[PDB]
Design a protein around this ligand. Structure first.
Ligand SMILES: [Pb+2]
Ligand SMILES: [Pb+2]
Length: 119
């Protein structure tokens, strides 16, 4: 209801690259409906695009608790850990992404690179 309205507005602002606004609007939506997995996921993405990887991780984790079939979310969580230098975590989440979407070339590549980084 208003939760959907806020989510819709977050999405519009997200797509235009206004992350600060999108983050505000997603947070409003989730105050009203905390079960919207796509709102958690997109909030995560918006923080990720801001370079705020610890927030991204928090919100990706919440999205995946609600929707553990979101292959892209597993991949982006892996990216977020990779950005923090947490290559063990990145590797795990990339492996999970590829189980659901074996065709994610970038997941395979980052997984490979992450394995090099640890050694
Ligand atoms: Pb936090
Ligand atoms: Pb873990």
């Amino acid at each position: 209801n208003s939760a959907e309205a806020w989510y819709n507005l977050g999405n519009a602002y997200y797509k235009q690259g206004d992350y600060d606004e999108a983050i505000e609007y997603y947070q409003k939506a989730l105050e009203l409906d905390p079960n919207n997995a796509e709102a958690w996921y997109n909030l995560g993405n918006a923080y990720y695009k801001q370079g705020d990887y610890d927030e991204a991780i928090e919100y990706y984790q919440k999205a995946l608790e609600l929707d553990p079939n979101n292959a892209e979310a597993w991949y982006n969580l892996g990216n977020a850990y990779y950005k923090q230098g947490d290559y063990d975590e990145a590797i795990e989440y990339y492996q999970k992404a590829l189980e659901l979407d074996p065709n994610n070339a970038e997941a395979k590549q980052n997984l490979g690179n992450a394995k090099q980084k640890q050694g």
